[PDB]
Design a protein around this nucleic acid. Structure first.
Ligand SMILES: [Zn+2]
Ligand SMILES: [Zn+2]
Lengths: 126, 131
DNA sequence: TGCAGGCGCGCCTGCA
DNA sequence: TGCAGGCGCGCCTGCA
DNA sequence: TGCAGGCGCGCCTGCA
DNA sequence: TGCAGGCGCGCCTGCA
């Protein structure tokens, strides 16, 4: 679609503070996943082919569930579903776990699955 | 390839799967709108690429026609074109035209009330909004 | 050469 | 007086 | 009673 | 071995 001149000019475009923050959040996750054998590999498979079923990609759970990245807090399944699937995701009230997920946020286990393809988008209850 | 600007190859790979929000998608539409205008003028696209490639070197005016209210519409959104393109390539948090002043180098600054308005982001400086 | 659809500038109203 | 947004006629392209 | 944000102690790395 | 600074989870308050 896009012409080669437009792509060239877009490379000079400045990313806003939310885009800069999302890079910080991705880096935070990579430091965690690099420590687990196969984790970075499993996530990349999930992201590359959305139509094919993938395994859980989990991180440790905090007491309130929230994760802090560069002075901002959020729920990690919301954080990474915003990054790779729905940038306009409102809250956790808009997400539901698929049957394949063994560590979904809400299951109250030691680890929480952050694989964006283990959750589906729903309507927030009235 | 810097100290602070550096992203690791793993982060770079994962970031390629990142979805851009509705403002980023809009900014691509705005850039495309400008390229259809500049491709019609001899040397215009070239001067724009020059301006953005080397910010330290002086560039010439890169102008587009001016509308009656000054506003430009791109994909159902309106704004002032010098604000629009200064947000794209220089300051994403730019509030309004009140935060902008033209440099003496600019022959066609917004507010000069001329047929054409300069959209070269390096022909404007960021200032404090008057109270 | 007739349709058919998409979108922006110039118009309009509605606030404060 | 200034902004801010909404919508249509006149423009445009894309077919056959 | 759920969010939301602010900040410090305990952790960590990077020097010499 | 010592310092020096950076940042996050667990704490805290402030609303409705
Ligand atoms: Zn899962
Ligand atoms: Zn100029």
């Amino acid at each position: 679609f896009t012409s080669p001149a437009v792509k060239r000019l877009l490379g000079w475009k400045q990313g806003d503070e939310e885009e800069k923050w999302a890079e910080k959040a991705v880096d935070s996750l990579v430091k965690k996943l690099k420590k687990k054998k196969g984790a970075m590999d499993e996530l990349e498979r999930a992201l590359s082919c959305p139509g094919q079923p993938s395994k859980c990609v989990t991180i440790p759970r905090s007491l309130d569930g929230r994760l802090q990245v560069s002075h901002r807090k959020g729920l990690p399944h919301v954080i990474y579903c915003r990054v790779w699937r729905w940038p306009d995701l409102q809250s956790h009230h808009e997400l539901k776990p698929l049957e394949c997920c063994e560590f979904p946020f809400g299951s109250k286990q030691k680890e929480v699955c952050i694989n964006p393809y283990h959750y589906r988008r729903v309507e927030t209850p009235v």
